[PDB]
Symmetry: C3
Subunit: 276 residues, 3 copies
């Protein structure tokens, strides 16, 4: 039911089973799917497409103007949201810009928590947790099952690979390989092993986790340069397909791969001081 105290543009298409609470404002050419609830005080920008079974909390702003100095009124701007999402209080999801395709997209089954910001042209996958205060600048890709903890910041054009975990207040300025744990290097971020807890919970087998950890070693513990490491990883991925996401993220990197700048202190050459 559309509450009598909501404002809805007449061109909006709202499924019968959708709940539009009091004091919601729904813009031009919006589509809202079946069984989606907008609790109260929700603003939906022009052209937004929202799927089924979504729960959107008060003071969430969805599909409104990008914050981009290159944007000007007359540009087409859109947010697409999938199904089964929870979007909490004061979240902001902005539409895309003309320099790409004008689309910000969010997939399925995500938990987007309080004060979370998803900037213009982001691509958010499925089954993701964005904890309170996460901020994603424009053009950020977050892959399936990733966890970004509270106050995590991700700079423009960065990618977080599948099943990664980013710890409280880490700043992500380079691409994060899948499966990784990333801690705050106070200002910045560093690799901190594999997300073994998430992986066990999601049904990864000992054999799969062994291969993922070996890739971690190849990347960060064997004294190899990125060219040499990537070549080894590609060969590994042939036999073990659970490693394919490594090939994706590293191969298509825009901003370079997250490194451990202090690996030389703990790599093979540092720790091998005996024969055998």
């Amino acid at each position: 039911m559309i509450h009598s105290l909501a404002v809805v543009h007449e061109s909006a298409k709202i499924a019968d089973s959708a709940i539009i609470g009091p004091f919601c404002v729904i813009g031009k050419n919006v589509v809202i799917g079946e069984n989606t609830e907008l609790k109260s005080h929700v603003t939906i920008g022009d052209n937004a497409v929202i799927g089924k079974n979504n729960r959107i909390f008060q003071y969430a702003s969805i599909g409104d103007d990008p914050i981009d100095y290159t944007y000007k009124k007359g540009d087409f701007s859109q947010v697409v949201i999938g199904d089964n999402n929870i979007i909490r209080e004061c979240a902001t999801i902005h539409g895309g810009t003309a320099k790409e395709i004008g689309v910000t997209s969010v997939g399925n089954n995500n938990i987007i928590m309080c004060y979370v910001h998803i900037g213009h042209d982001c691509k958010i996958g499925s089954y993701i947790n964005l904890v309170n205060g996460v901020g994603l600048a424009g053009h950020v890709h977050i892959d399936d099952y990733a966890i970004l903890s509270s106050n995590v910041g991700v700079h423009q054009f960065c990618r977080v690979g599948k099943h990664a975990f980013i710890a409280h207040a880490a700043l992500v300025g380079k691409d994060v390989p899948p499966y990784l744990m990333v801690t705050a290097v106070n200002a910045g971020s560093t690799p901190c092993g594999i997300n073994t807890e998430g992986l066990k919970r999601r049904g990864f087998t000992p054999e799969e986790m062994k291969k993922i950890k070996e890739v971690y070693k190849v990347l960060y513990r064997k004294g190899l340069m990125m060219k040499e490491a990537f070549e080894i990883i590609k060969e590994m991925a042939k036999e073990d397909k659970v490693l394919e996401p490594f090939v994706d993220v590293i191969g298509t990197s825009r901003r370079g791969i997250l490194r451990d700048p202090n690996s030389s202190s703990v790599d093979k050459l540092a720790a091998a001081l005996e024969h055998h």
Copy 2:
């Protein structure tokens, strides 16, 4: 007066002298006490109990669903708020969960500032300042008179003892003894002496402050392990009751006590290089 433009469920109990501003949304079985003002755009969740003389600012969300993967609709969730509180813009206070008692509680005379988040099952005491952007994950206990500065984050199940001061952007991952100053170790937090400024202002005497500082030494400067330090503190507390809160926080710790990991650099054994 209940503004004509507010939405109030008919089962809500609102004192005559309460002010419910325009565009407020008040849920089922809510109780709002005498002389409490809800300025405008305030959302109050089902079952919430709010005391007297409270001032709640626009876009504050109080008593709504917990963010907890263990929560499911059908669970009883409640926020209890005491008297004389100020709750500022965009604050979020979530109800409790079924794994405890389903109650988040806030005491008296608190200042909860802009964008502050009080997660499920928190217990907030009285006379506390939570500065802009403070985030408290579930099950956090904040004791009386504590100051948590801007952007302070506290992880789940942690406790901040009475009269503590937590500096800008510190992350609290262990229990904080009463009376302490805590600074940001950039990512994390460390002890930085006693909150002498707050303590003087609150009427603590030279004798009391001398004993509190001696406990600081026992904990962090005498080269003692926690078992040995706690035993000394317990004996001290018999003679001087101002130390009792030390016994409370340390004795009942869930997450361990905040340490100085670099105490060995500045302890008795490091600084004693002469006789006498």
Copy 3:
């Protein structure tokens, strides 16, 4: 047009061409100028003065009570905002206090982004970017063209000089000279050269940039104390007027000047180990 679903006090003066969206709340003795839009859900506090061509987004709170323990009802509190500003979602701009003049002021052509907090008695100049989550405690001065990146915090009474750039999550606790790049020293902030990118974009010439960089050297690379450096800078400013803002910020400092505490590691005396 004033939307039928907005609440406007009868003493408010609103220009014909102003757009007051649905669910806005406009307080006593407010003035809103020509061609300013308040999108929806905007709260404007008593006595606020807003200029022309402003665009203010949903859930922005402007001109309401200061967060100051010295403030009491009956004190005059005001926000003044200039022209051509963009103020994004969930921004909070608080009025001034009685200990100064009771005025918070914002100039022209600013971009104030999501969740930005401008505390009591701030003075914000023109052409400034305050990126998401910036927090300015009371009495903060931000000079023209400054960029404060996401989650930057500025303590009370601090000044950021013209054309400065403050990097992600830096904490500003001292005055920042004009033209500087400032990075997060994880907890705190440090000088990191000159804002050469902003300066080139704003039409600064090679000669001007050469002089600005020489002042950087005088301040941070020649092993000089602040008294000696300031005296040299003052003489430099006579010949080259682009340096005058250095004289302003350093000469009138309330909180001291931002230093590089580790300059002795990289100064003239450290790097000069040969003749010639």
